[PDB]
Design a protein around this ligand. Sequence first.
Ligand code: JW5
Ligand code: JW5
Lengths: 257, 257
Amino acid sequence: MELSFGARAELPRIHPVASKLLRLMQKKETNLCLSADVSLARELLQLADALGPSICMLKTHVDILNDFTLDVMKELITLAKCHEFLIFENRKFADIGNTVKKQYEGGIFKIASWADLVNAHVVPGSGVVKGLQEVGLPLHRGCLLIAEMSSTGSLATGDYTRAAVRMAEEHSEFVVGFISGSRVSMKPEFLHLTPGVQLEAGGDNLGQQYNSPQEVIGKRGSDIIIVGRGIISAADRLEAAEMYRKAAWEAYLSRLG
Amino acid sequence: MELSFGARAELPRIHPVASKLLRLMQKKETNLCLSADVSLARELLQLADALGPSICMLKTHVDILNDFTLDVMKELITLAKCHEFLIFENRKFADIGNTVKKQYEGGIFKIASWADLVNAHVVPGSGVVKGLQEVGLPLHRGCLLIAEMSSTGSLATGDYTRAAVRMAEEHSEFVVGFISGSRVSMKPEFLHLTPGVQLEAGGDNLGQQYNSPQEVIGKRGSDIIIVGRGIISAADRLEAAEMYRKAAWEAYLSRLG
Ligand SMILES: O=c1cc(CO)n([C@@H]2O[C@H](COP(=O)(O)O)[C@@H](O)[C@H]2O)c(=O)[nH]1
Ligand SMILES: O=c1cc(CO)n([C@@H]2O[C@H](COP(=O)(O)O)[C@@H](O)[C@H]2O)c(=O)[nH]1
């Protein structure tokens, strides 16, 4: 039946990036992804260093960093290697393949040079994956497909979600999992990462909706929680991260039995 | 029945950005949007200057510019004002409102400071529009919603397309039209902009599919053609732009009768 993260890391069809992730999740007893939604490089780096031991992944929006430089990403990579977490740039590539390939490799951000993982919306059809793959496969990177969204009015439901799952399963050499609210693939080689997570019930004023780690990992069968404001707006971000880590980890263990 | 671009510019419910666009389209006899998919600021600017008289709009992907600076955008604005065209950043905002508001205003690109128009995918629900509006309305900007896509396997069909149209029509203070393959709204106050356009039949190797200006403007009832490689890969980009302009303009006139 259900396998531990450590065993999933060894599955025949596992992607190397997924394997690296699954192994460090097991080693560190963390299935928490920090959503580092900050505008200052110094804050990003100080969070990455202090919280690194508590997280399996740090999710970036590099396009909201007021003082982005590639040197900032070099320093982030140093922390990622030191503390053992992956870097996930939440770029949401969402256009024709020819365009996304350039967006992934080029420009000022050079996302493919530092990001272990990126994500894509599936709305354009499988060309979005094919374009990204042309850059990501040579660079030994992975991709997540957005199969469901956390926000009110999300159209990523029903046949749309099914299409995302098929697209992932048909591009397993590059696609390693999903942004989703629940387990959407029955194949254990794929990771499920779930945003819209806080300990307390609520939402924001712009359509975000929250569920708890126990709900999303335990009841809905996801693997990793993505948490932004629940941690970032807290006074003690380290303690907050530990609370989220312990919640997500125990929900995982209990579901494993 | 059908109104000229000039008359549409005066409609009671017209958005000011739409009005400005419609008036310059009529004045200049152009419903061509150049997709300036280049990596060099100098090429971007030289295209903008030479082709400015032939276009109603210049569409950017600032994240593929290797030498982006805000000064480049200042120079682009100077050309836009001189030649009378709008600047459209094809950012495809596609996340929860709280995130997109920061992506629109902030970061290195400060998109809202220079872009007349941006676009958004509707997959997250109407929060994507609400978040963007919080920045764009004060700055007197407009937004386009992606109702259909040109690429093979597009999921922007059926109820998804209907949802995009409703979302636009319910946020008319900020949303001024669509990226689509055809007329999708029956309300003349909304613009339809159509990518996937070349004179010759064909596609690319990454899921792009082409139709002609006569097909998309004439038969499918769209307003503006978005053209990248058909112009940019041509030797004489000025002549190419003129060919596309004259095609799209005559298709418009004939449909007007
Ligand atoms: O459906 C989604 C998809 C994404 C992409 O990961 N996100 C992102 O997770 C994070 C949630 O942050 P929060 O915990 O502060 O709401 C944000 O960066 C948001 O853009 C969501 O919140 N919901
Ligand atoms: O459905 C879409 C949506 C977009 C967003 O505008 N686009 C964009 O139009 C342009 C088409 O370029 P081409 O004429 O070279 O194919 C590209 O920048 C591509 O990213 C499309 O090609 N199709």
